[PDB]
Design an enzyme around this catalytic site. Structure first.
Site, PDB file in Angstrom:
ATOM      1  N   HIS A  41      -5.705 -18.271   6.600  1.00 32.21           N
ATOM      2  CA  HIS A  41      -5.266 -17.330   7.243  1.00 32.21           C
ATOM      3  C   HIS A  41      -5.900 -17.082   8.842  1.00 32.21           C
ATOM      4  O   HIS A  41      -5.825 -16.013   9.663  1.00 32.21           O
ATOM      5  CB  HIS A  41      -5.509 -15.852   6.969  1.00 32.21           C
ATOM      6  CG  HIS A  41      -4.696 -15.520   5.810  1.00 32.21           C
ATOM      7  ND1 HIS A  41      -3.707 -14.926   5.551  1.00 32.21           N
ATOM      8  CD2 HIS A  41      -4.864 -15.970   4.459  1.00 32.21           C
ATOM      9  CE1 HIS A  41      -3.383 -14.976   4.415  1.00 32.21           C
ATOM     10  NE2 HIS A  41      -3.894 -15.437   3.531  1.00 32.21           N
ATOM     11  N   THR A  78       0.931  -8.322   9.951  1.00 34.21           N
ATOM     12  CA  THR A  78       1.930  -7.635   9.208  1.00 34.21           C
ATOM     13  C   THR A  78       2.124  -6.246   9.558  1.00 34.21           C
ATOM     14  O   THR A  78       3.466  -5.856   9.396  1.00 34.21           O
ATOM     15  CB  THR A  78       1.674  -7.677   7.786  1.00 34.21           C
ATOM     16  OG1 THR A  78       0.786  -6.917   7.529  1.00 34.21           O
ATOM     17  CG2 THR A  78       1.631  -9.317   7.358  1.00 34.21           C
ATOM     18  N   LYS A 137      -9.983  -6.673  19.310  1.00 34.18           N
ATOM     19  CA  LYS A 137      -8.806  -6.137  18.668  1.00 34.18           C
ATOM     20  C   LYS A 137      -8.430  -5.044  19.943  1.00 34.18           C
ATOM     21  O   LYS A 137      -7.168  -4.569  20.301  1.00 34.18           O
ATOM     22  CB  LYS A 137      -8.784  -5.117  17.427  1.00 34.18           C
ATOM     23  CG  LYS A 137      -9.311  -6.129  16.201  1.00 34.18           C
ATOM     24  CD  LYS A 137      -7.600  -6.553  15.571  1.00 34.18           C
ATOM     25  CE  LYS A 137      -7.973  -6.891  14.204  1.00 34.18           C
ATOM     26  NZ  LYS A 137      -6.994  -8.100  13.929  1.00 34.18           N
ATOM     27  N   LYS A 186       5.760  -3.847  10.188  1.00 34.78           N
ATOM     28  CA  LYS A 186       6.239  -2.643   9.687  1.00 34.78           C
ATOM     29  C   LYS A 186       6.697  -1.701  10.871  1.00 34.78           C
ATOM     30  O   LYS A 186       7.745  -0.887  10.781  1.00 34.78           O
ATOM     31  CB  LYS A 186       5.062  -1.963   8.910  1.00 34.78           C
ATOM     32  CG  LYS A 186       4.423  -3.026   7.803  1.00 34.78           C
ATOM     33  CD  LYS A 186       2.944  -2.427   7.403  1.00 34.78           C
ATOM     34  CE  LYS A 186       2.537  -3.017   6.568  1.00 34.78           C
ATOM     35  NZ  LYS A 186       1.196  -2.775   6.210  1.00 34.78           N
ATOM     36  N   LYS A 190      -5.802  -0.646  13.613  1.00 34.31           N
ATOM     37  CA  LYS A 190      -6.450  -1.933  12.971  1.00 34.31           C
ATOM     38  C   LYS A 190      -7.600  -1.799  12.854  1.00 34.31           C
ATOM     39  O   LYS A 190      -8.448  -0.942  13.342  1.00 34.31           O
ATOM     40  CB  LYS A 190      -6.117  -2.961  13.998  1.00 34.31           C
ATOM     41  CG  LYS A 190      -5.306  -3.039  15.228  1.00 34.31           C
ATOM     42  CD  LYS A 190      -4.528  -4.140  15.631  1.00 34.31           C
ATOM     43  CE  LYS A 190      -3.135  -4.073  14.968  1.00 34.31           C
ATOM     44  NZ  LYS A 190      -2.557  -5.148  14.651  1.00 34.31           N
ATOM     45  N   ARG A 191      -8.505  -2.739  12.162  1.00 39.82           N
ATOM     46  CA  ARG A 191      -9.674  -2.958  11.937  1.00 39.82           C
ATOM     47  C   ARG A 191     -10.343  -2.429  13.400  1.00 39.82           C
ATOM     48  O   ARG A 191      -9.763  -3.126  14.417  1.00 39.82           O
ATOM     49  CB  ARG A 191     -10.133  -4.114  11.424  1.00 39.82           C
ATOM     50  CG  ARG A 191     -11.644  -4.496  11.337  1.00 39.82           C
ATOM     51  CD  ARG A 191     -11.777  -5.499  10.187  1.00 39.82           C
ATOM     52  NE  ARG A 191     -10.878  -6.607  10.626  1.00 39.82           N
ATOM     53  CZ  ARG A 191     -11.263  -7.932  11.287  1.00 39.82           C
ATOM     54  NH1 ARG A 191     -12.678  -7.789  11.833  1.00 39.82           N
ATOM     55  NH2 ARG A 191     -10.405  -8.851  11.622  1.00 39.82           N
TER      56      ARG A 191
HETATM   57  C1  LIG Z   1      -0.055  -3.631   6.553  1.00 37.66           C
HETATM   58  C2  LIG Z   1      -1.288  -2.896   6.648  1.00 37.66           C
HETATM   59  C3  LIG Z   1      -2.522  -3.956   7.270  1.00 37.66           C
HETATM   60  C4  LIG Z   1      -2.191  -5.031   7.662  1.00 37.66           C
HETATM   61  O1  LIG Z   1      -2.437  -5.072   9.098  1.00 37.66           O
HETATM   62  P1  LIG Z   1      -2.816  -6.002  10.117  1.00 37.66           P
HETATM   63  O2  LIG Z   1      -1.744  -5.852  11.404  1.00 37.66           O
HETATM   64  O3  LIG Z   1      -2.599  -7.582   9.593  1.00 37.66           O
HETATM   65  O4  LIG Z   1      -4.236  -5.855  10.649  1.00 37.66           O
HETATM   66  C5  LIG Z   1      -3.851  -3.173   7.127  1.00 37.66           C
HETATM   67  N1  LIG Z   1      -4.053  -2.151   6.715  1.00 37.66           N
HETATM   68  C6  LIG Z   1      -2.864  -1.357   6.112  1.00 37.66           C
HETATM   69  C7  LIG Z   1      -3.168   0.004   5.520  1.00 37.66           C
HETATM   70  C8  LIG Z   1      -1.920  -1.917   5.987  1.00 37.66           C
HETATM   71  O5  LIG Z   1      -0.934  -0.986   5.661  1.00 37.66           O
END
Ligand SMILES: *Cc1c(COP(=O)(O)O)cnc(C)c1O
Ligand SMILES: OC[C@H]1O[C@H](O[C@H]2[C@H](O)[C@@H](O)[C@@H](O[C@H]3[C@H](O)[C@@H](O)[C@@H](O)O[C@@H]3CO)O[C@@H]2CO)[C@H](O)[C@@H](O)[C@@H]1O
Ligand SMILES: OC[C@H]1O[C@H](O[C@H]2[C@H](O)[C@@H](O)[C@@H](O[C@H]3[C@H](O)[C@@H](O)[C@@H](O)O[C@@H]3CO)O[C@@H]2CO)[C@H](O)[C@@H](O)[C@@H]1O
Ligand SMILES: *Cc1c(COP(=O)(O)O)cnc(C)c1O
Lengths: 824, 824
Positions: free
Chosen positions: B362, B666, B561, B670, B555-556
Site C-alpha cells: 500500500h 478509499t 495530508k 465513499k 484523514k489522519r
Molecule cells: C474509509 C475510512 C478510512 C480510510 O480513509 P483514507 O481516505 O484511506 O484515509 C479511514 N477511517 C475511517 C473511519 C473510514 O471510514
C-alpha cells in the site's frame, strides 16, 4: 436428533433436553461441531441458570416490596464447591434432568465430573458460610452473602516426588456458567490517600488509588421453595481510562498499567503471603474492598426500598454479620459512609453502626486474633484510623470514668495497643467493643470466650455474648451426596421431611437392630465404597480394596491436627504386619488409610508431613507381603468435590487434634451424618457429636483439654516417659525404610523438653498409646459386622442437631431479628 | 408489557420483540430493574446474533462438506465500526426490528447510538479490510479474515483546551455482544527461546515464553445471502499455571505475573510506540502472534476437511493474503510449521509456501517499507531468522546462477541488508521474493511499484506483479448510511439491484439535468445536512447552518495530508470576511468547514494543527459579524461512526495530499458515491475518481507528482516566491488573533529552504494559490444550484467502479483462484 427449543421453565425430560440443546447452539463457548461432556456441562448449567434467574428475580422483587429486615453475611471465604447437583436437587428436577441428558447421549454423573469447584474459599470458615447460604435460602430468610470473586483460589495442590506443589486454580479460565454480572452495580473503593478537613468540620477521604468494585451474583436456591437468594461477589477493576497511554507508548508497560495490576492483585488469591509490607497491605486491601463495596451496596438497597427514608430505620432493616475478624473494617467504613458521604453526626452514626453489626469468633487462642501495624493502617486507610482512634478514645474515657476496677487493664482492653516497638490495632477488640452481639461456634468455645478471652468485656456488657453451635446442610451433605442412603432413610422413616427437619432421623433408632435395614445399609455403604475406590484409583493411581476398612483423615495439614500421629500409627501397624507370620496376618482387619489436606506453602513441617505420608504410601502400597492388609494414600487437592466423594464412602474418620485446640469442626458432622464412626479426642464438635450419637457409638481417646497444660509442664520438667511403640515408630521412620528423604528435622519437633519448635508441644507422643488402643477397639468392633452396622445407623440417627437449619434459625431469632419471607 | 419468548429465527415485529425481552431477562448483564437504551442495545444485538449464529454455522458446515479452496486474509487492523445497522440491513430485517423496538418503547436510532465501535483498527488499511469482509460474504466466497482482538484500539480522541488528548478505548469494558468465544480453538505461540538441532537433522524451536492464542469469531453476514463468514480474532492469554505463586506470596506481584503481563501487552493497543527496544519487540510480537495463531488454525482446518491428506493439495485449498508487510512473518512461520511440526523438507515446504502466500503493498515511499534490526529478530524469533537467512541464501544463489546482470544489485535486492552501521531484515523484499503475486491498490500506484520500487524483481518475475484497485462496500457506505438517497436511486433506476451491481448507477447519467431528480436529490442532501447539524451540535456544542456549504476533510492528521493548508485557507477567508463591508459579505457563499482526524501522540506538528483548528473555530464561530458566512469545527474522535454521520451530509470533501504521496484513499470513494464533490490533487484514488465521474465534476489543483521533485529543488536553490495571500494567512495566525498559543514553531515548518522539518517539503506554500483558485471555483459552482446538483448526481452515477465487490471478484479470479460457494 433433539432440536433446540428454549424453555426457561423446562420441567420434563423433553423440554429440558430442548433447552440444553438451545443453549449449546445459541449460547456457544466452543466450535459448533463439538458436543462433548464439557460442552454438555456448560449447556446444562446454563439450562439450570434460566430457572435460577427467574427465581432470583421473583425473590428480589418480593424482598423489595416487603422491605423486610435483611441480613448480610460478610465472609473472606465461601467454599461453594460444584453447583450442578445441588441446583438440580433444590429444584427437585433430578429425574427429568438425568433423563434429558440420557436422551442427549450422556450420564448425568459424567457431565457432573466436568465441573470445576468455585475457588472462592479455603477451609471451614468458607464452607460454614456456604452451608449458611443454603439454609438461609431454604428457611426463606431475607439474607445474602457478600464475598470476593477470587480468580485463583488459595491453590490447587498437586503431589510430586517433592511432595506438595502449589499451582493457581483455573476455574475461571474459560467461564463460570452460574454467575450473573451486573454492570450497573459498580462502586468506587479508595486506598491510601489522605483526609481533607472542611471549614465546617466535616471530613472527606480524598486522593490515593480508586478501584471499581463490580458485582457478580451467584444464585442460591432453597430446598422446596421458590426463595433464591444471592452470594454477591466483587471483582476489583481499573477503568480503561486508568491505563496511561503515554507510558505504554514509551515502553513502560508496568508503570502504564499499575492501577490495573493493583486491582488484579486484590482478587488473585485468598490469603496472599504477608511476611512483607506489600503482602500485609494486600491483605488489608482485600478486607477493605469487601467491606466498602458491600456496605455501599447495602445502603443503596436500603434507600431503594423507600416508598417515599430516616436513618433511624437502618438498624431495624439491616443486620451485618462479620464472619471472623476479616470484615472488621465494616465498622469504621459504615461510620465513614454515614458521617462523610451521608452527613450524620458521630453519635447518630454510632448508634446505627453498633445496632447493625454483629461478630462471630472462631478461635480458642488469643495469639491467633488479628492485629495490624498502626503505621500500615494509617498509610492505607487514614480516615478509618481517624475513626478507630475516636472509637478507642471514647471507650477508654468510659472505662476511666466508670470502671476504676479496670484501670490497670486499659492497656489490654483498648483497641489500640501502643506498645513502643510494634504498636497495633487489635481487630477483635474493635469487633467486641462495636458489635451488639458476639458469638462463638460451640458451647465450650463460647464459654471459653466469656470466661478467658473476653472476660473484662463480658463484665462491661453481660448480654453481648451468645453461643451459636455450627451446623451443616443435609441437602449437600446427605440428600445429594448419598442419594441411595437417602432413599433407604426415606423408605424407613416413611417420609422425606427429614431433608428439612433433620431431627426426624431419630426415627431410625427403633430399627438399628433390624437385619433387613442393616442389609440395605451395608449395600448402600458398599456402593459408595466402590465409587470411592474408582475415584481414588483415578486421581492417585492406587487400586484400593472396597472390602477393607476405609479410614479417612481430611483437614488442613498442621502439627496441632496431628496427621503426624496418624502416620506414625500407620508406620507402626506396617512394621508389625511385616514382622507377623502370614498365618497371623490373616487375623487382622484389612484397612485402607486415606489422609488429605493442604499445607500453607511456607509452613515447613506441614510440607514435610505431606511428604512423609506419600513416602510411606509409596513403600506400603508396593510391598506385596502386607499390601493386602494395609494401604496408605494421600488424597490430593482436598476440596468440596473430594469431600463429596470421600464422605459417603467413609467408615471411620479421624478427628484427632490436640484437646482444647478446636472451636468446632463441621467435617466431623458430615461424617457422622453419613454413618461413618469417629475416632477422636474430646475437643470441638466431637464433644456434641458423641453426646448426640451416644458414647457407645464413638471411639474416644487421649488427653482432655484441662490435662494438656499439666502434661506440657511434666515434659518440661523431664518427667515424660515415651511409650515403646511410639519410639519404635519414630526410629523406623528414621531407618531409611522410606527412601533418602531425611525426616530427622521433622521428628526433632518431637524431641527434647524445652525450646520453641521442640518438645512435642501437641502431645503426639503422650496421646499415642491411647490412640493405638482406640485403633485396636475399632478393629474389634469392625469384625462384628452387625454391631458395626448398628453403630453406623445410630450415628446417622443421632445427627439431627447438626443441621445448619437449626443454626441459622437461632441466628435469625436471637441475633439478627429477621423472619421468613416466603416468595409467593 | 411485552413478554419474554425466545425465537432465534424471529422475522416479524412481535416475534423479534419477544426474543429481545428473552435476552434481556435470560442473557442479563445488568440488574433486572434496568431496561434503558443501553440494556436495549445489548438485548437487540443478542437477538440478531441468534440469526448470525445459525447462518455462521450453516456456512461453516457447507464449506466443510465442499472443501473449497479458501482465502484467509491477514490484517493488523479491521475498522469494523458499529455492527447493528449493518446486521439488520444485510438480514433485510429493517422494518421488523424498528417496529419491535417501537413496541418496546424505543426508536432504533437511539439504541443504535449506544453501540461503541469495535476498536480493532485505526485507518484506511483497516477499513479496506472491513469492506473486503463484507464483499467476501456478499459474493459467497469461501474467505475469512484473521485479526487481533485489541482491547483499547489506538485511542479515543478527546478535545480539551490543550487540543488533542488520548485515552484508551473502552468498547470491551462491559462486553461485545457480537463475538463468539471458542474455548476449544487455542494455539501456543512462542517468543524468544532458541533452536534445538536433533540428531536426525530436524530442528525445533524450544524454550522462551509461550502464550496461548484464543479465538473469537465475529460473524460477517452477506447482503442477500445466507453466506456468513468470519473475522476470527485472537486474544493473547497466559495460563493460570503461568502465575508464580511463590513469587506472589513473597510480595513480588510484577515478577509473579510477568507472563500474564506480556500476554496482555500484545492486545492492549494498535501500533504501540516503538522508539525503544521494548516497543520494537512488542510490535514484532503482535505480528508474529497474528501470523502463528492464524496459520496453525488454517492448517488444522485443512486437515479437518480430509475425507480419507497430501501436502501437495495445500496450495490448491489455501490462499493467504498479506495486507501490507505486517504479516510478513506468515512466510517463515508457514515454513516452520511445515518443516518442524509437520516433517516436510525445505524444497516441498517452499513450494507449498510460495504458492499459498500473496502480498498487497500500500505504499509509494521506499522509506516507508518495514525493516527490523537483525539482532532483534534473532533475539525474538531465532528459528525464523534461520529460515529467512536460508531463503535469502537461496535467492542470492538464484541471482548468481541465472541473472548475473543483477550481481551488482544483490546488496539492495537481498532480504538481509548487512550494512555494517545498521544491519536489517527488509520485510517487503521477503514478501516480494516469497509471494506468487504482489499487487498495488491503484493503477498508478501499481505502475510505480513495477517501474521504480521493485523494478529488478519485476525483471526476475514478470508475471508476479498485478494491480487491484481498492473499493468500498455500497451496503455500509450508501444503502445503510444514506437510506433516503438509496430510495431515490432505486426509484430512478427502477431497480434495487445496484446494491450488488453498482455499475448500474451509470443509468442515473441520463437524468443528471432532470429538474424533478435534482429537487429530490437536494431534499435528500438537506435532510442529511440537518442530521449532521444535530450531531455536530451534540458532540461539539456548535450550532451550524444546514443551508451553508458543508466542506469536510477527515484523514489522519499529518503534514503531507495538508490540513495546515486547509486551515490557512480558512484563516484567509475569515480575514477577508472581516474586512468586507456587510453589503459585500452577502455576495459570498456561506460555508461550514469541518476537519477531523487523529494525530499520532508524539507527532508534535500534527498535534499543533489540531490545536490550531480548534483555536480558529473558537474565534470564528463566536464572531457574530461573520459567523453567518463562516464556521469551522474540529470534529472529534473520527472513526467509522463519525464518517457515517459526515459522509451522507457532505457537499465538498478535500483530498489534498501532496501529489505523489498517496497510493489510494478509499474515503474519497465513499464521498463520491454519496454525491459529494472533491477538491483534490492528482494523486491516489482522485485520479480514477476524476476519470469515472468526469473532469468537469471535480475540482483539481496543484502540482502534479512529476513536478514535485523539481519544485523541491527550486526551493532548495532559493528560487521559490511565496504568494502574498499565503504570507498574509501566516502572519494573521501569528498575530495573536487566535489566543495566547504561539503558532510560530508550527509555521516554521513552512520557513527556510533546507533542513529536516523545515522548508515546506509538502508544498503548502507552492500549491496554496491554485488551491485558493479552486476554492473560488467551488463557490462559483455552488451558487449555480442546478449545475451543482448535476455534478453531484454525475458523481454518484460514476462511482460504480469503486465497489469493493468488483475489487474482491478480481482478487478471487486473478490471485486466489477461489469461486462462489453459496450456502443452500
Ligand atoms: C474509509 C475510512 C478510512 C480510510 O480513509 P483514507 O481516505 O484511506 O484515509 C479511514 N477511517 C475511517 C473511519 C473510514 O471510514
Ligand atoms: O457530630 C460531631 C462530628 O462527628 C464527626 O467528627 C468525628 C470525626 O469524623 C473523627 O475523625 C473524630 O475527629 C477527631 C479527629 O480525627 C482528630 O484529628 C481531632 O481533630 O480530634 C477529633 C475529635 O476527637 O471524631 C469526631 C467527633 O467526635 C464528623 O466528622 C463531624 O462532621 C461531626 O460534626
Ligand atoms: O530439505 C530437507 C531439510 O530441510 C530443512 O532444513 C533447513 C533448515 O530448516 C533451515 O534452517 C536451513 O538450515 C541451515 C541452518 O539454519 C544453519 O545453521 C546452516 O548453517 O545450515 C543449515 C542448512 O542450510 O536450511 C535447511 C535446508 O537447506 C529441515 O529442517 C531439515 O530437517 C530437512 O532435512
Ligand atoms: C466441611 C469442609 C471443611 C471444614 O472441615 P473442618 O472439620 O473444620 O476441618 C473443609 N473443607 C471442605 C472441603 C469441607 O467440605
Amino acid at each position: 436428533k433433539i432440536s433446540a427449543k428454549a424453555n426457561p421453565e423446562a420441567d420434563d425430560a423433553t423440554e429440558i433436553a430442548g433447552n440444553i440443546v438451545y443453549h449449546a447452539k445459541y449460547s456457544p463457548h466452543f466450535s459448533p461441531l463439538k458436543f462433548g461432556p464439557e460442552q454438555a456441562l456448560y449447556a446444562t448449567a446454563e439450562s439450570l441458570r434460566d430457572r435460577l434467574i427467574q427465581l432470583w428475580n421473583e425473590t428480589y422483587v418480593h424482598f423489595n416490596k416487603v422491605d423486610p429486615k435483611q441480613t448480610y453475611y460478610l465472609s473472606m471465604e465461601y467454599l461453594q464447591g460444584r453447583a450442578l447437583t445441588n441446583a438440580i436437587g433444590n429444584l427437585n428436577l433430578q429425574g427429568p434432568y438425568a433423563d434429558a441428558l440420557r436422551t442427549l447421549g450422556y450420564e448425568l454423573e459424567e457431565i457432573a465430573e466436568q465441573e470445576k469447584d468455585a475457588a472462592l474459599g479455603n477451609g471451614g470458615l468458607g464452607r460454614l458460610a456456604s452451608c449458611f447460604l443454603d439454609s438461609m435460602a431454604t428457611l426463606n430468610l431475607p439474607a445474602w452473602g457478600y464475598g470476593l470473586r477470587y480468580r485463583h483460589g488459595l491453590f490447587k495442590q498437586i503431589i510430586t516426588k517433592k511432595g506438595q506443589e502449589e499451582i493457581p486454580e483455573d476455574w475461571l479460565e474459560k467461564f463460570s456458567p452460574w454467575e450473573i454480572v451486573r454492570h450497573d452495580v459498580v462502586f468506587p473503593v479508595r486506598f491510601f490517600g489522605k483526609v481533607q478537613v472542611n471549614p465546617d468540620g466535616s471530613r472527606k477521604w480524598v486522593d490515593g488509588d480508586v478501584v471499581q468494585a463490580l458485582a457478580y451474583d451467584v444464585p442460591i436456591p432453597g430446598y422446596g421453595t421458590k426463595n433464591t437468594i444471592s452470594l454477591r461477589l466483587w471483582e476489583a477493576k481499573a477503568r480503561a481510562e486508568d491505563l496511561d497511554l503515554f507510558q505504554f507508548n514509551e515502553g513502560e508497560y508496568e508503570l502504564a498499567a499499575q492501577l490495573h495490576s493493583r486491582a488484579q492483585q486484590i482478587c488473585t488469591v485468598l490469603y496472599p503471603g504477608d511476611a512483607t509490607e506489600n503482602g500485609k497491605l494486600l491483605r488489608l486491601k482485600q478486607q477493605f474492598f469487601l467491606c466498602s463495596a458491600s456496605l455501599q451496596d447495602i445502603i443503596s438497597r436500603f434507600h431503594e426500598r423507600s416508598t417515599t427514608r430516616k436513618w433511624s430505620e437502618f438498624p431495624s432493616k439491616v443486620a451485618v454479620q462479620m464472619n471472623d475478624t476479616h470484615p472488621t473494617l465494616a465498622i469504621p467504613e459504615l461510620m465513614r459512609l454515614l458521617m462523610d458521604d451521608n452527613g450524620l453526626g458521630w453519635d447518630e452514626a454510632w448508634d446505627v453502626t453498633s445496632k447493625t453489626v454483629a461478630y462471630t469468633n472462631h478461635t480458642v487462642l488469643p495469639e491467633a486474633l488479628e492485629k495490624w501495624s498502626q503505621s500500615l493502617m494509617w498509610k492505607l486507610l487514614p480516615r478509618h484510623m481517624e475513626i478507630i482512634e475516636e472509637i478507642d478514645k471514647r471507650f477508654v474515657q468510659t472505662i476511666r470514668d466508670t470502671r476504676v476496677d479496670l484501670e490497670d487493664k486499659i492497656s489490654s482492653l483498648s483497641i489500640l495497643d501502643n506498645n513502643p516497638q510494634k504498636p497495633v490495632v487489635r481487630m477483635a477488640n474493635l469487633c467486641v467493643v462495636s458489635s451488639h452481639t458476639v458469638n462463638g461456634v460451640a458451647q465450650l468455645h463460647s464459654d471459653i470466650l466469656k470466661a478467658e478471652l473476653f472476660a473484662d468485656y463480658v463484665s462491661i456488657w453481660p448480654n453481648k455474648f451468645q453461643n451459636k453451635t455450627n451446623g451443616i446442610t443435609p441437602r449437600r451433605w446427605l440428600r445429594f451426596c448419598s442419594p441411595e442412603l437417602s432413599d433407604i432413610i426415606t423408605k424407613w422413616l416413611k417420609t422425606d421431611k427429614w431433608i428439612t427437619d433433620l431431627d426426624l432421623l431419630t426415627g431410625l433408632r427403633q430399627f438399628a437392630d433390624n437385619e433387613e435395614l442393616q442389609s440395605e445399609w451395608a449395600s448402600a455403604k458398599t456402593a459408595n465404597k466402590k465409587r470411592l475406590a474408582q475415584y481414588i484409583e483415578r486421581v492417585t493411581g492406587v487400586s484400593i480394596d472396597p472390602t477393607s476398612l476405609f479410614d479417612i483423615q481430611v483437614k488442613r495439614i498442621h502439627e496441632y491436627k496431628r496427621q503426624l500421629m496418624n502416620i506414625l500409627g500407620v508406620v507402626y501397624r506396617f512394621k508389625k504386619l511385616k514382622e507377623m507370620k502370614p498365618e497371623e496376618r490373616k487375623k487382622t482387619v484389612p484397612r485402607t488409610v486415606m489422609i488429605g489436606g493442604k499445607a500453607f506453602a511456607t509452613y515447613t513441617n506441614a510440607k514435610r508431613i505431606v511428604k512423609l505420608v506419600n513416602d510411606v504410601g509409596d513403600v506400603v502400597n508396593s510391598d506385596p507381603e502386607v499390601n493386602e492388609y494395609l494401604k496408605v494414600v494421600f488424597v490430593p487437592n482436598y476440596n468440596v468435590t473430594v469431600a463429596e466423594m470421600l464422605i459417603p464412602g467413609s467408615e471411620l474418620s479421624q478427628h484427632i487434634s490436640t484437646a482444647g485446640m478446636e472451636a468446632s469442626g463441621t467435617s466431623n458432622m458430615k461424617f457422622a451424618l453419613n454413618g461413618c464412626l469417629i475416632i477422636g479426642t474430646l475437643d470441638g464438635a466431637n464433644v456434641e457429636i458423641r453426646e448426640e450419637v451416644g458414647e457407645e457409638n464413638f471411639f474416644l481417646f487421649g488427653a482432655t483439654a484441662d490435662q494438656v497444660p499439666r502434661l506440657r509442664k511434666e515434659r518440661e520438667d523431664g518427667l515424660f516417659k515415651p511409650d515403646p511403640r511410639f519410639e519404635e515408630a519414630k526410629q523406623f521412620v528414621k531407618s531409611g525404610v522410606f527412601g533418602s528423604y531425611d525426616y530427622g528435622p521433622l521428628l526433632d519437633s518431637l524431641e527434647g523438653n524445652t525450646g520453641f519448635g521442640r518438645g512435642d508441644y501437641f502431645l503426639v507422643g503422650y496421646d499415642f498409646p491411647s490412640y493405638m488402643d482406640a485403633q485396636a477397639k475399632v478393629d474389634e468392633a469392625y469384625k462384628d459386622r452387625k454391631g458395626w452396622l448398628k453403630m453406623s445407623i445410630l450415628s446417622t440417627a443421632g445427627s439431627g442437631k447438626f443441621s445448619s437449619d437449626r443454626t441459622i434459625a437461632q441466628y435469625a431469632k436471637e441475633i439478627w431479628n429477621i423472619e421468613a419471607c416466603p416468595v409467593p
